[PDB]
Chain A
Amino acid sequence: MQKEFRTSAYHSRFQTPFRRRQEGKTDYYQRKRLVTQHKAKYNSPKYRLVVRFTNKDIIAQIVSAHITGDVVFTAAYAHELPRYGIKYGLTNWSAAYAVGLLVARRALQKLGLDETYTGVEEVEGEFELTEAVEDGPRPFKVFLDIGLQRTTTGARVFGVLKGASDGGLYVPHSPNRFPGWDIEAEELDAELLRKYIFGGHVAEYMEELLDDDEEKYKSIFKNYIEEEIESEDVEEIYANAHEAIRADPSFKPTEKKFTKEQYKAESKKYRQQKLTRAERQAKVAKKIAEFK
């Protein structure tokens, strides 16, 4: 009774979206506004903090855009945190702060801005932008890129923001999306934010769930029990991690159990082959013959 919609004209006149738009990964509106540079600032690139959250990892890459593709300046991953003393909760707000701090420190170390622009060592949770030093280089300026993730107050992307800003990068931002902002009274509750930086909310959950349902605590916090880390022992974990990151932020790759040749050799055993023309023709001819 109704027309068959999937016609060959519908497919012929269909304009496919950009490949990364149809994978639902790039917002090109936001990307245009982020990347485009003042034309009187001729070849000086704009820099982005890409912050991406998978189910098990946190990615922080400092990226500048080019015609043939984006170029990574430095990158930091949450799976590097076991080297700095954080083993569990690698998608926390606190791990997010640690990753931001790590990428900021690695960037400043690679750029030579270590002695100048140390950052904020005595972390108290106060909104603070990195300020330039007189008669000297301006701070490394990057712009936060959260991609498709929604802006909410108390979101982990702004935890990475806070870490990168405290590492000494200059990242423009306002404090009204940190955990602790009061909309009715527009001030930042700095104690609550500093609690979030040092894992305090996780420790509060540990205390409450131990006092209420020790079986649920047993299941959820099993890793902490195995290491016998109690709720009082978390702030030191994150503080020691911050100290270790600030002491040595150099990148160390995970040593490869095989080289690229072995890796390519092993996976090719599980790639299917394309049929050649002779083979598809043979299949067609046999399918005609069998049909009688």
Chain B
Amino acid sequence: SDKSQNVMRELRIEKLVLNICVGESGDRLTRAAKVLEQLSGQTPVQSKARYTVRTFGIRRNEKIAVHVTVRGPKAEEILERGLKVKEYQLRSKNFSATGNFGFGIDEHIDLGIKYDPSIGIYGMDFYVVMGRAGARVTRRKRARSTIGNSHKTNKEDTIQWFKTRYDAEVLD
């Protein structure tokens, strides 16, 4: 038909990735893993450092960060809680050229997580990944290919979708 109004072009969340980069290991990384495990309802995975920097107090192949990827209704629920904590306030800078965006939260306790001195306060990073139907063609094993240009996501359409669906402001 060659139409941009087609039901298969509608944008939606592919995934949300929760990122806490505590710069070290020990009880802090364990606590951050626990807070991600509570917020997501999913076990998070540690990430190692790729090399050694003495300014950062960091060592190669030493556990520092922890992250969990979330998709489905859980992703959008955590997204709207995060945007509440941001008070629905994002900037055009937050939106990437390909069509994703994210922001930063200084405290999980702002999202409605019951404060525990066992865990404490941890800043967190949100990043949503947008997409349309048929993104499987770049992910599958057999006959993998690329997505056509008009089907690709981009900054402007994603800002439009965000402003419409979430009824927020994108302060240019």
Contact = CB atoms under 8 A, between A and B. Distances in A.
A and B, direct touch (CB closer than 8 Å):
yes
Contacts of A150: 141
Contacts of B144: 24
Contacts of A220: none
Count chain B CB atoms within 10 A of each CB in A148, A149, A150 and give the residue with the most: A148
B145 interface: yes
A268 B122 CA distance: 66
**What DSSP secondary structure best describes chain A's contact surface?**
loop
Contacts, number: 13
A119 B108 CA distance: 65
B7 interface: no
Nearest to B142: A148
Interface in A131-172: 147-150
A25 B141 contact: no
Contacts of B143: 23-25
A30 B36 CA distance: 42
A149 B144 CA distance: 13
Nearest to B137: A24
Count chain A CB atoms within 10 A of each CB in B142, B144, B145 and give the residue with the most: B142
Contacts of A25: 142-143
Interface of A: 23-25, 147-150
13 contacts: A23-B143, A24-B141, A24-B142, A24-B143, A24-B144, A24-B145, A25-B142, A25-B143, A147-B142, A148-B141, A148-B142, A149-B142, A150-B141
Given A25-B143, A147-B142, A149-B142, 8 more contacts: A23-B143, A24-B141, A24-B142, A24-B143, A24-B144, A24-B145, A25-B142, A148-B141
